[PDB]
Write a protein that binds this DNA or RNA. Sequence first.
DNA 1: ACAGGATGTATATATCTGACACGTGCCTGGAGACTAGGGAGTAATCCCCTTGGCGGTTAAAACGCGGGGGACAGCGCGTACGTGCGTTTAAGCGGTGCTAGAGCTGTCTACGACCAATTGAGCGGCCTCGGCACCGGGATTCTCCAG
DNA 2: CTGGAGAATCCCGGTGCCGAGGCCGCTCAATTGGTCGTAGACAGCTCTAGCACCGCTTAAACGCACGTACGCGCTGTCCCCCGCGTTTTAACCGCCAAGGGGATTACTCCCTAGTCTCCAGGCACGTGTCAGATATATACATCCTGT
Lengths: 99, 98, 80, 82, 73, 72, 113, 112, 95, 96
Amino acid sequence: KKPHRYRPGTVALREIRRYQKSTELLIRKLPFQRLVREIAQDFKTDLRFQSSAVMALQEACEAYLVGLFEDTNLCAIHAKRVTIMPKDIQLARRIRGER
Amino acid sequence: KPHRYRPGTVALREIRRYQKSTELLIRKLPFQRLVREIAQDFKTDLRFQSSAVMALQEACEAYLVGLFEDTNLCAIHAKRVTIMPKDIQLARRIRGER
Amino acid sequence: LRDNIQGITKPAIRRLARRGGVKRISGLIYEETRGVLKVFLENVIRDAVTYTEHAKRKTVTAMDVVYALKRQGRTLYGFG
Amino acid sequence: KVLRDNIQGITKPAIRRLARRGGVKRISGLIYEETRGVLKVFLENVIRDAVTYTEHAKRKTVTAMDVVYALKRQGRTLYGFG
Amino acid sequence: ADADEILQEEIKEYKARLTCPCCNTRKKDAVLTKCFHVFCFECVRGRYEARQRKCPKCNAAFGAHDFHRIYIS
Amino acid sequence: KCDEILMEEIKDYKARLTCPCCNMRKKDAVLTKCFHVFCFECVKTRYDTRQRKCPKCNAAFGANDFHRIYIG
Amino acid sequence: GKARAKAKTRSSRAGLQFPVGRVHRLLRKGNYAERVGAGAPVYLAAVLEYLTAEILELAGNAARDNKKTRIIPRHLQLAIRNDEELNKLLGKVTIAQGGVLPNIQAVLLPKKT
Amino acid sequence: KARAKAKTRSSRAGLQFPVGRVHRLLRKGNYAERVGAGAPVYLAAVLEYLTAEILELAGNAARDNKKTRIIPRHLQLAIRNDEELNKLLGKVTIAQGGVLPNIQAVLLPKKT
Amino acid sequence: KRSRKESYSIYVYKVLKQVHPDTGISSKAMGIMNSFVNDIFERIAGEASRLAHYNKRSTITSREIQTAVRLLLPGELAKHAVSEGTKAVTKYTSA
Amino acid sequence: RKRSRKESYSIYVYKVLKQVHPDTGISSKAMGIMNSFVNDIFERIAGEASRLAHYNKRSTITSREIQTAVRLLLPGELAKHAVSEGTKAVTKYTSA
DNA sequence: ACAGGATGTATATATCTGACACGTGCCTGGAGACTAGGGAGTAATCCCCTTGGCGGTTAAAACGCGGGGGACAGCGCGTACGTGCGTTTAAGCGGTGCTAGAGCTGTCTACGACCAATTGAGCGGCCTCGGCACCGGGATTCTCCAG
DNA sequence: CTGGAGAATCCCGGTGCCGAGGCCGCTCAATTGGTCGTAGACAGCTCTAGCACCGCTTAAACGCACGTACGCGCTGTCCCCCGCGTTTTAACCGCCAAGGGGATTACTCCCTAGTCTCCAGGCACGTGTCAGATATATACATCCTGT
Ligand SMILES: [Zn+2]
Ligand SMILES: [Zn+2]
Ligand SMILES: [Zn+2]
Ligand SMILES: [Zn+2]
């Protein structure tokens, strides 16, 4: 009786702790491989990629997106919110200088 | 009967007149004294070219104006029209200054 | 190869946000995150492909990627 | 002669004007002190780099060249001074 | 006379917290690394041998390698 | 001669709970590596000045090797 | 024999206003590479001249609508900031006496009831 | 025909890092048409000091992690836990280093 | 003797009179222009030097400058700059 | 097909590690991180010293240009300790 | 605020297993030794130009006050998102196989450095007039209260 | 919902001023024309690794149910910042004046490129073996329900 159910947020905090304690790639390797190949074929058709080049691109994108989500979370907390919304990412990117 | 403008309208007029204009918005001698104070904190018995102090004033004014633009965007993000020290801190930390 | 930006799945973006210390994520976050990731990849990959083209190579080496990242002020360690 | 507390010389209306150029409508009363602090930090960094450049050149006068190189070092390239 | 009385009072107060609260007889020479409290090494071996892994101060669990002698003097 | 012995107790007692390097204030830190006791702000200054060794045995210690201690 | 051409600047050979010779000298003394090709100063001078022409065209356009027949740093700043592509080329660059681009956030405008 | 056997400039300056390799790279990197004799010694000393600092911090992190082998995670912790070393490498990302574990205080449970 | 200094002032003015025959320029604007030209020259030349070092080339050619222009200049500006540089190099080769 | 040749700071980083942590090893990925770090800082110092020599119209890079480049690039107290180590090495090299 | 039930996490032992640390053979890149020539350190000079003071004055800062409009706490709601579960997808791992292109090597030639003579472009100084700064006055436009 | 009054701003015209631009003189660096060396383009070969496919397993993505907590709108209240007038103050301009040191020149010397020979430091490869994941087995720190 009464199956266990964690309250909304504590599981999220446990994932935060787990993924900040760990170092592996958080994006599946084959879809990111395919995405890199699509974005590359728009610049030079019939292109080949070193495997380490794709791992370097994946590391760069994971680091960039993690830092962007750090700034996004700070923007959301600034607006007295705990959820991140697209306007948070827009503000963070525009202050960082992309927009 | 005295005449008063409602708050914000004169502020908008200043925004317009200081975005149309290009002169330095900080008094020259106080900024020069601040520069010399920091420099003598770094190296004593130091001389400054006038062009060096003017270059520092342009750089500092540009940096502060950009910081206030980002701070204003932070204020608008928090559904506010006034800027607060937390807005400056958030903008600076997102820009990587903290 | 078409329409694999959704291959960067919703749970993957959630995991990236979790590493970034994000407790709650909106449902509209994922599409806009996919867009900004696409923009970032466009910039980096374009620079890497330019570096590859200069070398008269048809293979994008890891060194081209790290040079492209370094030029964008995003220096990466561990690939040369 | 030595100089003290000239950061207060960057007065409240000056910060008002700087924020007006930045398109700021309302300004909190605590903005001015934080602006003085961040301007002081920026000036410390730039002036330290310029003084280091001057010391390398065996010079005892800080030229505009030293300021320009110190700014271009910090990703804050300045035009109109050489 | 007042200065001597004050000196004796502060000496007694200093001896009060210089001593292990678990024993209150003789000086501390060790700490517990999981509760950040200072105890005496003979009290901690007494608690270790008799199989009570409870801190005398905060009741935090600790083991053999969770405490060590420290150099005061 | 009681007061002279009384004063001799003061100099010996107050020396062992004060930081041997700063020597004006009470020890409130302990190193894990060499298991010696110092004060917290001195060990913070030594870590911040990148002199991350014990003041007397020169044992290298990490950021987590030193922490607050409460002698009292 | 002493029969030789009088002079022919490499800028005029490439049809450029910018100096191919001075760009080549700056490349040599800049310690960029051990050697500098013949066409490298030509290409670099052409690129620099194109960028100069673009920014000067935009600056003159900005000066014309202010009833000014003389480009000032304000006109250059307006030209660079209006052109988002030159703006992104010179994003981390500040211009002395240029001011800022006039804009106000739409929410800061009066509600006008 | 009599001459000294060998004495590397790294050994002369008491440096582990190669003064000769740094000198060669300074000449071949097109930095100046001349490079002084003491410039590679100074640069090797600075590089060795920075290497020793980052390696000592990484080894301390590894020991606190009960690991006797340095991994990129330990290097990342060493960089991010030292503010000077962090802002020296502020615009630098480390492969497989992860992130410094932090959670914003507002995200913690309300304890209600 | 007398101090001598070089600048792109006459070149910038010739370009201006080519693009805007009846427009002037101020001393401060000319300083802005000279700083811009030196900055872009330094960026392109440094990038070309890096390309030569990466590819082990000991010389900077028009290929290095073209790659540097493609890397640094954004989008359509880079396209036009590459076209202009190629045009000038082909014109120079004939003469 | 002969064997090529590649240069690295791997053995130097290992010597420094063994003299700072005698009984601690380093992985290959961490060694790659370290080699990239050494290369990056080397090129950074060398570029700053090259620009310093160019600004002063000097044709040579001496220990003073590296001094100034370290004082500029390295932050805070890292700068002064690196200056101390560099001057120590230069003095001991000139002595011997 | 306090049990306890469950969930998750932190310590304590076998056990493989590649990766890492150490040993060997080269070999080519640093070291020794010596020359020569230019870069720069040093002494001297001189003339910008930076610093310092004094005085007028006047624009700007500082002060104080009235009030209004924005910040913030609190409330209510409703819906969007988190958590868990069953289902489905495709990622991942390994294994094979093919070959395209990275990488290296030998020719050699055609560019780039170097150098002597020179001359025309480009910079410093002069001077002038006109684009623009400034003053003033009227017309226009924006703001705000009060109907 | 505007009328109208007050205030800010734009536009028009007249006048002076200082700097933008053209001109002149000079000088030094870019040009021309050779030689010579060697950097790289260019063909050829090798073989590394990039790509493609296949199949099985299972981790993970996905779709759905359901609840809840938080994002957002509304209300009140309240107090802090804006507008504005007055007083002070010190910024700013002009002028004067001294001398500090930036900039340039001349001389010399010593420090570094360049060379040649040589050898050993470091790299590529090989190989033992041992932290180290990777399991279980056991003992605490939270999470949440419940009272
Ligand atoms: Zn006891
Ligand atoms: Zn305790
Ligand atoms: Zn102390
Ligand atoms: Zn010790």
